[model samples]
Target: ESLGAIKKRARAIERLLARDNLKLPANKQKELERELKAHKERIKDIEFKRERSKMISKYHMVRFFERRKALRFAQQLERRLSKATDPVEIAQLKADLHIAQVDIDYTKYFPFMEPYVSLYAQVRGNKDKGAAARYLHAPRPPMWYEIEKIREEGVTALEKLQNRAPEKVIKKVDAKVEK
Candidate 1:
């Protein structure tokens, strides 16, 4: 990166300015001092750019991993809804499916399944897609816990229907994404 080059020049200039016994003229000494200051500021600017880039990489990682998991459980919940018969169990599954679909579609609270709503979307697909880490770009996954919570909450809503909405949106957005 240019960072290395900038640092190299700064160090070289520092050594030049440190010469105390040299009969250097005033104009030349002033010029070197000015350049050294600019290089220091330029290094700071480069550091800020790297920080921004790292943050963006983290965000994409979160989407790739966390969102991917949520989609899986959403499909699983919908499939289980089909065989459910008990009114309470059916209601519970309806709610679970609703919540799952909601999270799958990046929403909150899954809708009730008056007739038992279902969120049967194309959940499981090939994961052989692009990877930021694999490409040697991102180091950290972003908002990982938030995505984790979405999956956990969807599962909890399944086991404990009380964990979800009572009235139900009665509708949820579909989970669809394009490459």
Candidate 2:
């Protein structure tokens, strides 16, 4: 039979299954069971493909956002530094740069990037890989344990900037960036 005929038969059987207390003749019942089995198998195949497509799309969206945000933050810092002058302004710019760099580095720990890293490790195997070593040395993965580390780094950088700000001019200079 043609594919269209098979699909129609399957739909009819599904409708019958949905009805309350409807009994089919022995031959019709057997035919309906066979059609139901084939329908379920086909549905499972379609569902598997749909699920994989969703995961790939989600991964790509996350990667895109992460890269875009990193680039935007980097460019903002570059612009801030370009116009900066005088000792006070330059010190403030440096502090801003450090903060932005730390944030960008931290974003790499986002879960979406985990699969890419895992795939890289699998492909490269475990043969004293220099690239993997560099990745490892790269900022320790962001975690609950790193909260204190982040606060410490940020506070230290801020304190250093405050120290560098000229004492006489400090009162007039508003160095804090508006979030």
Candidate 3:
């Protein structure tokens, strides 16, 4: 599970396989190659998943800030430029305003707009246009019951890796077992 640890193992295996005049057994070498491939694949998978989540977070935050700055610049920057004396500083300010305007245009792309508005609505507890209304108080069918059973079993399985009962409960259980 630890990418660092797996990378270390893969590095060691690579050095062992690559070193000159090494007398490693054929079967052992083949096994090490398999292990190294698995480790590298795991590393790639973990890196990709982390990268995707980072990209999602980055776009979400960037669009929010860009929209805010763009609005503020749009409202005040032009007014400031009209009263300004220095042509040099005026050009720079105009460039900044242009950049802010361009940044605000990211919503023109579907990838940026879709998740942004929908997720924004979800966070605000507002109904998303794309989502169908769910009947929260409706009765469950047999299929729903079966799904719940499977979900509960998964939760129980996950519990083994999670926190356990307190020490007081442990002592009580031990005492009961002794009886």
RMSD of 2: 21.6
When sorted by lDDT, best at the front, the candidate numbers are 3, 1, 2
lDDT of 2: 0.48
Per model, state how many residue pairs clash.
4, 0, 0
Q: Per-residue lDDT tens digits of candidate 1, residues 44-111?
A: 65654454345445444434454465576566666766877889978866765554444443322222
Give the winner by lDDT: 1 or 3.
Answer: 3
Among all windows of 10 consecutive residues in model 1, the one with the lowest summed lDDT is 170-179
Off by over 4 Å in 2: 1-11, 17-23, 61-135, 138-179
Clashing pairs in 3: none
Model 2: per-residue Cα lDDT over 43-68, one tens digit each = 44444444445544566654455445
Q: TM-scores of the models, in the given order?
A: 0.36, 0.31, 0.36
Deviating ranges (above 4 Å) for candidate 3: 62-179
Report the lDDT tens digits of candidate 3 across residue range 1-179: 59889878988989989986978897999998999888877776566555445545666664565456446555465677787779897886676555434333432221421233321232233232112112112233342333333334554543332222334434443443234
Order of all candidates by TM-score, from best down to worst? 3, 1, 2
lDDT of 1 at 37: 70
Tell me the lDDT of model 1 at 40.
Answer: 68
